[PDB]
Amino acid sequence: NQIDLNVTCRYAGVFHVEKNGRYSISRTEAADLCQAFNSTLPTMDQMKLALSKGFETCRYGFIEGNVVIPRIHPNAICAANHTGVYILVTSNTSHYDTYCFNASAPPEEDCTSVTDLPNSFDGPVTITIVNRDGTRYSKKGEYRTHQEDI
Numbered sequence: 001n002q003i004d005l006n007v008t009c010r011y012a013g014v015f016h017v018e019k020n021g022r023y024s025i026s027r028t029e030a031a032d033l034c035q036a037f038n039s040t041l042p043t044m045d046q047m048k049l050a051l052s053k054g055f056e057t058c059r060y061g062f063i064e065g066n067v068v069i070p071r072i073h074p075n076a077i078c079a080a081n082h083t084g085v086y087i088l089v090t091s092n093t094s095h096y097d098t099y100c101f102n103a104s105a106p107p108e109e110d111c112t113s114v115t116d117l118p119n120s121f122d123g124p125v126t127i128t129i130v131n132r133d134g135t136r137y138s139k140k141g142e143y144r145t146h147q148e149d150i
């Protein structure tokens with residue numbers, strides 16, 4: 001009973017979370033997952049400030065109100081070569097990665113590793129945070145509050 005959560009650097013408190021190496025998070029699960037990191041889904045303004053500090057990914061993820069990809073450099077296979085916060089307009093499907101916002105993180109680029117999941121609750125799952133440098137933090141718990149996300 002295991003969940004892998006790949007996380008990034010934080011930029012103005014904003015970071016990306018990919019679950020189990022595939023698009024697999026619902027919007028309800030995303031809010032709960034960010035809450036386990038004492039975080040919330042970013043607002044569009046928070047995401048734009050993070051972009052300005054150096055944040056970009058090549059993955060769709062929830063923010064408050066939309067699913068987006070922050071882009072700095074144009075790349076044909078990432079958000080159709082767009083720059084800025086690219087907003088997903090048309091999709092059949094509901095599951096993506098998520099972004100999260102932690103207000104207590106440093107104001108600009110923070111590329112230290114994540115070493116805690118501070119607000120998960122009691123449960124049976126081995127949750128492993130996987131940093132980009134491969135370092136891992138694991139703890140037994142749960143973060144999903146909606147049964148249909150389990």
Ligand SMILES: Cc1cc(C(=O)N(C(C)C)C2CC2)no1
Pocket residue numbers: 010015037038102105113114115116117118
């Ligand atoms: C202590 C401490 C802080 C971190 C860290 O990188 N975090 C990021 C994801 C905002 C916070 C939620 C735990 N890891 O350990």
